[PDB]
Symmetry: C4
Subunit: 407 residues, 4 copies
Amino acid sequence: LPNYTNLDLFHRAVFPFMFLAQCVAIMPLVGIRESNPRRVRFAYKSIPMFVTLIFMIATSILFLSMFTHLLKIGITAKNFVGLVFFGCVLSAYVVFIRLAKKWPAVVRIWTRTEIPFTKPPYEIPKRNLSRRVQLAALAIIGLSLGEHALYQVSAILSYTRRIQMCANITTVPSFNNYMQTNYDYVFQLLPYSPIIAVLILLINGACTFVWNYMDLFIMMISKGLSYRFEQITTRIRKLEHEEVCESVFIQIREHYVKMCELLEFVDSAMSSLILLSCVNNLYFVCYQLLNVFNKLRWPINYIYFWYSLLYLIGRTAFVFLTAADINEESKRGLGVLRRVSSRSWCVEVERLIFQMTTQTVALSGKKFYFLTRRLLFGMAGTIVTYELVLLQFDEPNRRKGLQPLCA
Amino acid sequence: LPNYTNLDLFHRAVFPFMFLAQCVAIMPLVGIRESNPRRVRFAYKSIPMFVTLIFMIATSILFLSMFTHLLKIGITAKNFVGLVFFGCVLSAYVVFIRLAKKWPAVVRIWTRTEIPFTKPPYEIPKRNLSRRVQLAALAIIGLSLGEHALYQVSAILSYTRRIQMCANITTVPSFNNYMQTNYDYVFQLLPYSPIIAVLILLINGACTFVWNYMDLFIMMISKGLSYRFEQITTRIRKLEHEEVCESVFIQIREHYVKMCELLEFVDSAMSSLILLSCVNNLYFVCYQLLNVFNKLRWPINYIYFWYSLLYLIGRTAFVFLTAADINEESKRGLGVLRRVSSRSWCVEVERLIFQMTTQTVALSGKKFYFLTRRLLFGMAGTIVTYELVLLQFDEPNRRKGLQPLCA
Amino acid sequence: LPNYTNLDLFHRAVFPFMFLAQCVAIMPLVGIRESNPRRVRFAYKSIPMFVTLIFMIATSILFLSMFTHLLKIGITAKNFVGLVFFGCVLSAYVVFIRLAKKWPAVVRIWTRTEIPFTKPPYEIPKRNLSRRVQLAALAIIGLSLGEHALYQVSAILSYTRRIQMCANITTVPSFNNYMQTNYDYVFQLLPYSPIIAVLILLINGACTFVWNYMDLFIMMISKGLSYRFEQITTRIRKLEHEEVCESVFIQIREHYVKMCELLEFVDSAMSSLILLSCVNNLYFVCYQLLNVFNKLRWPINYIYFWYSLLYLIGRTAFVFLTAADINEESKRGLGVLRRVSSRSWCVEVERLIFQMTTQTVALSGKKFYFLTRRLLFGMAGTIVTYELVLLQFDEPNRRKGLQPLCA
Amino acid sequence: LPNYTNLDLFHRAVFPFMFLAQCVAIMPLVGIRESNPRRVRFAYKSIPMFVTLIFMIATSILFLSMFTHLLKIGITAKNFVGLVFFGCVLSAYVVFIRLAKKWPAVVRIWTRTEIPFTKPPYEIPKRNLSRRVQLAALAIIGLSLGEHALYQVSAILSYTRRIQMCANITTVPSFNNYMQTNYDYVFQLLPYSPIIAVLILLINGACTFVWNYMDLFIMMISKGLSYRFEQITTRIRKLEHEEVCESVFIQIREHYVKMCELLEFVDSAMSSLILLSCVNNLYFVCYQLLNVFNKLRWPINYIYFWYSLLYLIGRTAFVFLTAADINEESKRGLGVLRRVSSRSWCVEVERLIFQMTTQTVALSGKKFYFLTRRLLFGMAGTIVTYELVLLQFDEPNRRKGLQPLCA
Ligand SMILES: OC[C@H]1O[C@@](CO)(O[C@H]2O[C@H](CO)[C@@H](O)[C@H](O)[C@H]2O)[C@@H](O)[C@@H]1O
Ligand SMILES: OC[C@H]1O[C@@](CO)(O[C@H]2O[C@H](CO)[C@@H](O)[C@H](O)[C@H]2O)[C@@H](O)[C@@H]1O
Ligand SMILES: OC[C@H]1O[C@@](CO)(O[C@H]2O[C@H](CO)[C@@H](O)[C@H](O)[C@H]2O)[C@@H](O)[C@@H]1O
Ligand SMILES: OC[C@H]1O[C@@](CO)(O[C@H]2O[C@H](CO)[C@@H](O)[C@H](O)[C@H]2O)[C@@H](O)[C@@H]1O
């Protein structure tokens, strides 16, 4: 068997972050940290699944807390965002549980499919798969932490500043009052307690991580797939000015076909996650873009909103762009195959060129759409159209302005 | 001749539900229950056509009843839905009469085209065609009955509750008063009578069945077509790791071409029904989605509206998804044909791959659009755009709220 | 030389209606009635060009009259329709002058290209080209005459009824007063005179004829091209169950390529006309659809408005559908070519199938769009979106209602 | 080495205008005027880069001047255009600096790629590359000068006329007062001085040139690329009725492939410039189209607005049309290759036809969209949709009308 310890494989590149996601109980797999991917299994009776049940239960408590709170105070387009957030996180937990069920099969086919690319004539690029996944994961994790850190600073400063500069109701600032104030939707159903207070803080942070891991997981998966397609393209580039034997083209076509089979298998497994992530990002991007003209009290509120908005747009763009790289990388070998000399031309090149030319090699949201650069352009155009129409809806609330600080 | 009694054919799978539709006189064919499809004929002078005339006449009476009533009370965007419903049902009767005229030719070509798939190397799947059609038909029929049952319960409870809790005009509840109240558009033109009262109830239920059978018929037809394409794909999957003789690929291509010819014949026959169903579903989905924010008096009204809305959206989605399965199943054999070894490669595979790759094998609305997964995504995007623009129109009536119960 | 007298050619099919258009000086060609198309020439110094100059001068007089009138009374979205109409008629005159300049070459290439289809193995269909063109042209001309007659009847009845039922300002009805009232935009610049009155009536009729003849000419050209494409399709259908020699396929491919070259030439010649017709039809359809909910005084006004709207929508739809018939007929031979046996298969069939599959054989608006059924569906969707957005603009004037009769 | 002095090369055609752009420090390249393109180099320590720093610094001063001014007086959808203009110009400077970095590589591959087309069997067209670039450049430069000349005349006349016909505040007209009045956003931050006054005038003119050179540069680049594709098409047209040796098709395919490689290299280098130009043009076209119904005081204001609007729309259209000519010219050789006789048919023609047919040979905005005629149609449709929705936003300000002259 191959030595999985040091090979540049996808499983080695993502397991550190898959295990990290298991800390918040995202995808409950057993033995995800094993060097051999064949040891990865899904078991309902396991510690990872138990933690997932705890997080799903507690997340449902927050969802019910928000649901009951909104009913008491009425449901408006601005309060509905909170309910959608918890609903999306709960859907993510379910989607990732199903993805956990299919992962052992996916990782097994992925490993045996990518073994040929770990040996010549394929060469490891300047930035290996582990480094590519780490940079994307750390960037998303780092930006997500800053986004949540700004959220807490913005909420805390707004709370304290309102009390301090009130010349009115004082309610001396404290951790207890802040929790009952900013998280009223929770404590309006459950009795307050410092133990519960920190639990809500941790689980809201966990919900934030889950909301961000959907996009991160798609990025790491996209990085792993476009990594091998790039290697195929690099190998083809080595044949630009040479007479190529028909055997070489047979291997290239077979490896390309195997990669396409793996993408189809991975696409089917992740079809629901892509669909959930795309709709979740579209709603929040549209929702946030509708509040760009709204007036906020403190500069920190502006900093958080624009950091949150830019990060959300950037995260959405890079999910599509990283996924679209699979499509772009597949078509990059076409330009070199078209330069094949007349003597080297054979049926295998004709077969390969036809497949690259006519096949859409990309991840898809249940085949309803394919993650390509054209789709991201279409998504941007769709968002602009929605915002132009939706901004008329928000004109009344926009002109009301910010409410009095004391009130 | 083949033994049609026990063969797994399309005619056997749909005739039980085609006959059921003939009870409400949808598609007036003679001998639809015959085991031999060659005995199915269309005759104007026949009992099925007579019943169709009766239902068409009575449905026209309801259409005129609604038309005259709206003129007396004015036509608004909310009352126009009732006129569209009866107009769509009448169009369905005409469309199905024309489809009845073409059915004998369609069922004859369908039967002789699918005979090859009833014998090896084609194998019956886990769920045969009869079971696939039954599950779809019973699900649609069962959901449609619940949708109408909720409509009657919602209407009856609203009627009785308004009278009971009025402390005002009493008009002691009775079957007679309910009929004159909720169905005023009928009795405002025809004299009331208990015999007419039940007739309106039955024919409105029949109109509901016809409105739902348009989508059901497209589903059963789509199930029958994707059934054979799936068998072709399954047969191709049996050749993944084998050296295939050129004769095998000749048969596969010929059977695939014959299936494509049948789809073209079926698509032309059903082009009007698909077009009518799509426009009918689009209007009602858009109309109902415009009333999600409206306030209803009783919880039963909310239950009916959301059951009606979700069922309508689900029915529309599954019509497109079931029809799109023909397109998806055609492209599923491409992945296996691309794995054909270099020795097994021949002109027949090249011909077949080119046809699968470049031909759009799907049902179409008069070729204006093709029922694919991309179209359903486009339909959803179009509906969202219309609702965002149309919700501005409905804002005034939305803020008026529900009227006083007694008034 | 071939006997042009009795051959089933496009020039024989269209020259009667081209001469009828010349009677209103649309396309000023010399010898359009000649049996030999080679005798058709474009000359600036000719009677047709003189009549075209006269009609253009008078149409410009009407356009300036409307422009000055609107400037005096202000320009509104409702008043701009007449200025757009006159500008479109003038643009049609210019475009048809250019098309006349290009027409000798177009007709010569068309004649030398369609000669092969006048002899076996091609057969004249049930409805020959002359009959198809006659049916289309007579339908369009009769509908346009009915539309203009309804317009005149509606205007005259409105005027006379306003005068008679006024119990107020009388201005006893007369031809002079009617002309000065309904055509004030003309006589507000030129002195009134009965000669000028009848001239204005005749020239407005001519403008209507030109506006309809743009679409009529597009229809006749589309019929002429789809005729030969259908002949090719029928010849291919004649080979469904036969072993075909390579020479037959060579001839079929050569004829198809010649037809495609002719289509490219005709599209280059008529791109400006197609673009102008499409934009004019889109604008007028949107404008008329924006007035469906408006309230008109007399039933004759409703009859005229709805006849005009339905005729305009049907004319646009039939222009698009007749043009897309070329694409449909080009693609219809693919189904039969795909059934070619393995023994009859050769390089020529592969070339022909590739051309039919990958080439878009259709008329285009300067290549910005191609007249296909997908394009008609997209046009319908775009019109729906534009109407949904614009009905908000017209809500105020819609709720203002009809003005007092006497006022 | 080839004699670059008199050869009809791209570098010779554009360097006169690239050098002119360097006067306003657009693309800081060293030795752009050298006959040999290999002498063109990019150096940060050079005079062209120094001038770019000066213009970038001063443009940033104007951007800050506008930014601070808007904050003092509030940011509105009408005031934001000025900030976008300076932001786009600054982005253009950065984009062109990066393009300057890549230009030496681009011009080197471009020169060696186009050498084959300077010798038979390729012939220089009626209008050589230098003439084609000159006509486009002079037209854009000439129209841009008129657009700015009208802007200054419109601003000066409005300023003087307001003072002269005021019967109120006089502030006798002078150069000093005009600068402090129309350019208050600058002098509200910097002290006024006649030296600064002219500097602002020159740099605003330079900013206008930079805003127009983005489109001009794309045009000249598009002209250079479609020039060689047209030569390939012309060479193929020379083989319409001849028996062609396989060697000829090898050369044609190799030259076509080399041209496609050059387009890919050029497209990647100019991907950011195309993206910036498209978004900049879309915003300004949409912004200006929103003010067509606004009322301006003097006719000169109307002349400037409509000259500015028509030029902006025309410039945007011709950028897309000139770029789309690369796509159109690539597909023009297909029609002749399809006429290749059966004896001349070979694998090379099949390879070439497949590439022309299936490859999208066009410039792209980072592959998000391709500059084709379909895209320009889509752009026009998108603009119409935005304007219809956005015109509702601008209705309030539209009905306010022009403010009092004295006020
Ligand atoms: O469901 C509302 C709930 O979300 C919280 C949880 O901490 O904030 C998260 O969700 C927001 C979007 O709804 C994000 O903007 C934010 O970054 C994220 O932390 C709370 O704001 C709220 O209680
Ligand atoms: O035409 C209005 C008419 O439709 C009825 C007939 O029973 O209800 C049917 O049509 C509704 C949509 O218009 C559906 O929501 C409903 O499920 C269906 O039964 C009556 O409501 C009405 O008289
Ligand atoms: O330009 C306005 C002018 O058009 C007239 C001329 O008879 O009517 C023609 O144009 C209308 C659309 O603007 C059509 O509806 C009508 O069918 C056609 O006759 C007059 O209405 C008007 O003076
Ligand atoms: O940034 C606003 C600034 O642009 C100026 C600079 O002269 O005018 C240029 O920009 C306008 C669009 O914003 C163009 O219409 C105009 O043609 C161009 O000269 C000034 O108007 C203004 O100070």
